[PDB]
Structure 1
């Protein structure tokens, strides 16, 4: 029931501004505090600021302050985070977090977190990915794959058989090419007996370019 939805991943030019939303559902937004946390590539969690959606008061981190502006719309039950003058160092995954009071203990704790929103600070244009199948030439286990080549920005979401086939799936992290475009492969290991008797479709999805591919590997 208690959920913390977040807006889709965004790409912005260096020097511009980005506004990320946080949809609160399954609990009264006014009853808690909302935090924003920046998570740099592979680096530690960095707290940005807190808002009291009920009154509006804000407490920002001394380094983030002046560039971060947290807003909240109680009627729409959503919290927003605006970050301007975007530098290459601002390219990270941003998380919104619910902080609830615990009556029994008499303390407050940052319990629930949002799924996260990736911010890409780049000059390169938004491009849809080229999907290619990965089937070999001619033992028990047989490997099939999908090559999500040449795309910008990150990320892409690869499913198999509309989310039915989950076991054996290995979607590797995207590798940044010299071309400046990203690329990742998604492999799935299935037995030879089941092969030729079942359809094997990979469900590629790139939301920034509104690309949606459903390629069958044979």
Structure 2
């Protein structure tokens, strides 16, 4: 099927230019245009621009002075470049294929002079036919985002992964929990799989009742 995949830096310093690649498949870049859209955290959608089949480009008037879009048809790749960066350019960036019907998964780019930092993962152990809760705390990482699954995606029912909070230190913290039957705490294994792509930091943390 038609697929669009973004590759982006995650963290970029405001002294740099933001550069994102979108690799497409399933349609002709020579025939169809590709657009870029962004969404700041907690806010709405903003169209940035488009590159058409023949290479012509259109940009949003408010940002026309900062944006540049080009492409390589032979590689089925589209390139976005955003200049004059500020912290308020932090957003999820999407490439969007024909008819605006196929969207990439989106890549969260953070504009900051701070440094990348991978998280520590701590267990939230179930307390000592009854429902029990367990989880993990993903503490002190930068920038967003972190993803969390349980038992390598085998456990989805009852899972709640919460929005991250920004601590006073400038680092984020996130929790993920799951509720299970209390009768399973002694016989099932519970593992939270944490991925912090901006730092290529991955952790698998087993959570068990405290001894």
TM-score between the two structures when normalised by the length of structure 1:
0.91
For the residue of structure 2 that corresponds to 1:29, the secondary structure is coil
| Contact 2:7–2:107 (8 Å) recurs in 1 | yes
Q: How do 1:101-112 and structure 2 match up within 5 A?
A: 109-112=99-102
Q: Distance in 1 between matches of 2:171 and 2:120?
A: 11
Distance 1:214 1:8, change over 3 A: farther
| Contact 2:129–2:183 (8 Å) recurs in 1 | no
Q: How do 1:65-214 and structure 2 match up within 5 A?
A: 65-99=64-98, 109-138=99-128, 140-214=130-204
Q: Distance in 2 between matches of 1:113 and 1:159?
A: 23
Q: Once superposed, what is the RMSD of the aligned Cα atoms?
A: 1.3
The residue aligned with 2:5 is 5
TM-fit CA distance, 1:2:
1.4
Count of matched residue positions in the alignment of Structure 1 and Structure 2: 208
CA deviations 1:115-170 (Å, max 9, x no partner) are: 11111011111001010000144271111111000000100111111111011110
| Contact 2:126–2:132 (8 Å) recurs in 1 | no
Q: Distance in 2 between matches of 1:212 and 1:94?
A: 23
| Contact 1:13–1:121 (8 Å) recurs in 2 | yes
| Contact 1:15–1:84 (8 Å) recurs in 2 | no
| Contact 1:39–1:94 (8 Å) recurs in 2 | yes
Q: Which has the higher helix share?
A: 2
Q: In structure 2, list runs of 5 or more residues that go unmatched.
A: none
Over 6 Å off, 4+ runs: none
Q: Distance in 2 between matches of 1:182 and 1:205?
A: 14
Q: Distance in 1 between matches of 2:191 and 2:62?
A: 47
